[PDB]
Amino acid sequence: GSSGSSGRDRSTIARIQFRLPDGSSFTNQFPSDAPLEEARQFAAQTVGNTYGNFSLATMFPRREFTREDYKRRLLDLELAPSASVVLLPAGRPATSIVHSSSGDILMID
């Protein structure tokens, strides 16, 4: 992944609805600027290694996004206001490694 993530907080906001094959669905809040990928990152964490290398697609135009689509901002993909990205399961899981951290400056409340 050449294009990395850019943690930024802007006034603008975008609505991205995530539909699942099971039935449930989650909708996060991302900046109209945030790259489509952003949504893919969250969804991947929300479901984790449940579906695997799943994918994302539209609902109306039913057009399978492209590597480029993830390179352009959301608002650019006409997903500024309301967007509906359906999660398409693949079947094969995606091996990964987790981590853990902890710290406290003699402070407890």
Domain ranges across the chain: 13-89
Q: Among 69, 92, 82, which Cα is nearest to 28's? A: 82
**Greatest pairwise CA separation for the chain in angstroms:** 55
Q: Among 39, 33, 48, 45, which Cα is nearest to 86's? A: 39
Q: How far out from the chain centre does Cα 5 lie?
A: 11
Cα→Cα distances 6→33, 34, 37, 41, 71, Å: 10, 8, 11, 12, 12
The structure tokens listed for 78 are 């006409």
> Determination technique for this PDB entry?
NMR
72 SS3 class: coil
Ramachandran angles phi, psi of 45, nearest 5°: -80, -40
Strand partners, 82: 15
Q: How many helices (H) and strands (E) does the chain have?
A: 1, 4
SS3 content of the chain, % helix, strand, coil (to 5): 15, 25, 65
Q: Among 39, 40, 31, which Cα is nearest to 75's? A: 31
**Where are any strands of DSSP class E within 1-109?**
14-19, 25-30, 55-57, 82-88
In this structure, what DSSP letter does residue 49 have? T
* Degrees to nearest 5, angle at CA 62 with 10 and 33: 10
CATH level 3 topology of 13-89: Ubiquitin-like (UB roll) (3.10.20)
